[PDB]
Write a protein that binds this ligand. Sequence first.
Ligand SMILES: Nc1nc2c(ncn2[C@@H]2O[C@H](COP(=O)(O)OP(=O)(O)O)[C@@H](O)[C@H]2O)c(=O)[nH]1
Ligand SMILES: Nc1nc2c(ncn2[C@@H]2O[C@H](COP(=O)(O)OP(=O)(O)O)[C@@H](O)[C@H]2O)c(=O)[nH]1
Lengths: 116, 369, 369, 110
Amino acid sequence: DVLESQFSQLLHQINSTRDFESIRLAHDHFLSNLLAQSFILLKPVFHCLNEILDLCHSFCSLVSQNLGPLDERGAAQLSILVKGFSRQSSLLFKILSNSDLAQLLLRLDYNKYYTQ
Amino acid sequence: REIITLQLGQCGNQIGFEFWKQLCAEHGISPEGIVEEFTDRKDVFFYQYIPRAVLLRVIHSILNSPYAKLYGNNWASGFSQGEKIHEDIFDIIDREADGSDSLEGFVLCHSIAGTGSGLGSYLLERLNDRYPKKLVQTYSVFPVQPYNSLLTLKRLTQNADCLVVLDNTALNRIATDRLHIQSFSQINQLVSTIMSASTTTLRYPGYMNNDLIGLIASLIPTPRLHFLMTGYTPLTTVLDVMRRLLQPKNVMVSNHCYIAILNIIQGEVDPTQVHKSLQRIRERKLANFIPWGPASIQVALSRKSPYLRVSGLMMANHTSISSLFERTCRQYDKLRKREDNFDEMDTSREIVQQLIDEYHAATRPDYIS
Amino acid sequence: REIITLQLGQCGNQIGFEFWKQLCAEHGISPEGIVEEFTDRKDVFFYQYIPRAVLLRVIHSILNSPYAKLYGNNWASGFSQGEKIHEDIFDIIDREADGSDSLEGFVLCHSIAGTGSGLGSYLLERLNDRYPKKLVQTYSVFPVQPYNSLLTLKRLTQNADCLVVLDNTALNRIATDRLHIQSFSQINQLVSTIMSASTTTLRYPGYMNNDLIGLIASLIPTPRLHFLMTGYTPLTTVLDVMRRLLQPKNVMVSNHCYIAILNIIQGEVDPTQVHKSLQRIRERKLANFIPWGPASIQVALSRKSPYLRVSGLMMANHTSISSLFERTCRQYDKLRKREDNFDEMDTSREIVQQLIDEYHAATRPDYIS
Amino acid sequence: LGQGDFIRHLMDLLKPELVRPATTLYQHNLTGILETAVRATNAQFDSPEILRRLDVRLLEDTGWDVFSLDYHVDGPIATVFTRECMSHYLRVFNFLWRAKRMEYILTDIR
Ligand SMILES: Nc1nc2c(ncn2[C@@H]2O[C@H](COP(=O)(O)OP(=O)(O)O)[C@@H](O)[C@H]2O)c(=O)[nH]1
Ligand SMILES: Nc1nc2c(ncn2[C@@H]2O[C@H](COP(=O)(O)OP(=O)(O)O)[C@@H](O)[C@H]2O)c(=O)[nH]1
């Protein structure tokens, strides 16, 4: 809903203006929006969610690197991330509190983070 | 990743044949199993074309259809025969498995009412035995009749990693209201529209939802709560759709709150307003949710078949489905006082009661632990 | 916020049907309930367009009308039959309430003179049971008639949150003066104009009075004194309208003093001279006010419907309304000495005596305590 | 506040939020409610351009002391308002906000 929405405008600005000069600008603004909307340029959020990205690599590996219960220092490693993840979770929450309105609404549909 | 279908009993074989009818017509595939001249990724349900079906009197009716080129009553009576021809049918599944690139799941279409009830019970156990790595989704159908239904539950509660419910009594009520039928061949038509729309995002190439795991994994939070119910509005903005879905007059079911909601939009609606509808819908606080687990409402777009206007289908995991089970259990208890060991029914009686508690406990602020 | 209207008895249906005709023509709504091409906030009284009406022989003549696409005689007989269909009519209200975004109140149009009057008294009590936080305003209409009139008064004094009186004796005299009629369909023309004008500041939003409680919170000083009377200037400066409404030969009512006044000027008048006129009207002392607490006069402007000149509407709270109850009271006693317990009549006769006793004591310098 | 219909709904939605102290208040949350409020009232039928400038600002207690609308304006039209009309409207908007909550309190008591 940022791709299929920004794209649906880029294609509409094409079939409207018979001029070509608009296309070089409509397409250029389309591209800048993706870098701006998808938070790729916004450094703080992009340097916080990035920590969430590689975080799941560790957790998913932990469950796949065995088939028994988390006893051999897995639980000892398990409680490490939740102290950081849940910290990283609510850390992001203060960041969003222009464009985040479309995003934070979905995560907050049941007001769960409101209890965080 | 291909998914093969399995059809049992009268109901299963009748709707699955029609399920393909709607599916083959959705693509440009003539009844004689060939592409017509006249984008749509068809790898999941067709092999090169031939559908990956495994069917098990009525076959005569199907073999007499123009689609000839497209390929007891007690639970004990059904389960007994299935064990005898175990190796016979599992040859078909095996030869269809390795013939597939990477098998992913096992759709099952049957009615819990009679041979499909027991044979399906036999299959699900054996399917989990040989294959432990395969998802098992089932399109079970609800209505001595109660005894057959309770036995199937005992298997469906722990084997099938996913499930959908389709009750005829609620479906038949939709017939007299909006279709004025008073017929199986008519009430089945809605099922085909329900089934086909249930798997729209799999055949049309999209950003996400490219696998059965990509759909169900959002709904089922815990392997105990693996039941869904369906909703279908078109019988025109996105807000018009989402409102008409959540009305209790449209859903196919006969305190309580949702666990997760999925929305399937098969129209060409403008996708800029979709995030707006959720805003207004959330504010209206039209639907209640669990207070323990963070979840949301899922909405996904699609495209209608150009070879065939906006539709919409909704997938729901509502704790109100526990009410239906009670009726079966309530009736059985009446039968147990009305008339080689008769203990298998007793153990199932226990395990089905556990599921009723798990739903009831799920609506609490402290369901966990 | 929304306001659901109810129409009871022959009178409620007629004056409500004429209220909706006038309200549809005031807006851009075709008789087919479809918006014509041809600012006015219409979400309060119309649902996306569908009126939020609950109608309760006369229905057939409404259904044979061009507006079909827009949707005994005792008090005890009218009370019991409502008890036997208690669950029935509420399902219509329960779905309309929860289908509504945020309910605000319940407009009731009924005549207290007899199945409709009996049904009304029943419904007024149950709404207090179920919904405690919803206003109930009643556009009652005054005329074994003395019996039924006082019984419903027992409920209207402690159940209905507000009340606007409209007596036929004052309307009929107006029809035999400026109307010159010598019919029910004729006097209802005037009733429709007062009703349509009463909720004018709700449909055309302004800086103030954007909710039903905003109009009522100023007039009604205590929950007991919740009776109002009306005044129509026409049957031009703003100083003329005010001096043409305070006159007693324009009020729809057959010492004493005013408690609060509200003026609705619906014209295109100059809104800068409105504050001037209130500066002069005070000097001539055209109205006498309560001595205990402070009271004033209120003027509110609006805009007439362009799709259809200066008009006025005066809502006042005069203690002279106590006389109307006295007539019904005295008429009751004469029949009580002339002819399972007959104890409800005793309680109703007693409670209305306290209401009258409040009014006569509301005009004293020591109404406090 | 010349609209009245829109400010009514906007005072019903900010009630659960502003009762909390200002320390737990973050601007990113109130905007969502503001967008919904325009749709929930008659202000939706309006020029999209002027609706692009209407937002919220957080003055710098309680949530009923730091909330106020801004309606920032830049460009050629900014030569009529000149940063002083925007420093006067906010000086007015407080007096119209107080005299509006002191009324919806007194219609709640009633
Ligand atoms: N809704 C629906 N239900 C069906 C249809 N055909 C069969 N059924 C259900 O299947 C049950 C009977 O199955 P049955 O004929 O005994 O299966 P069999 O023993 O394998 O032949 C009934 O309870 C029906 O509700 C159909 O076309 N539509
Ligand atoms: N103001 C007004 N009152 C009416 C109208 N029609 C009937 N009424 C009143 O309704 C009363 C008759 O009630 P009726 O219709 O017999 O009650 P029902 O038979 O129980 O519906 C009379 O005393 C009238 O005063 C009308 O058009 N306007």
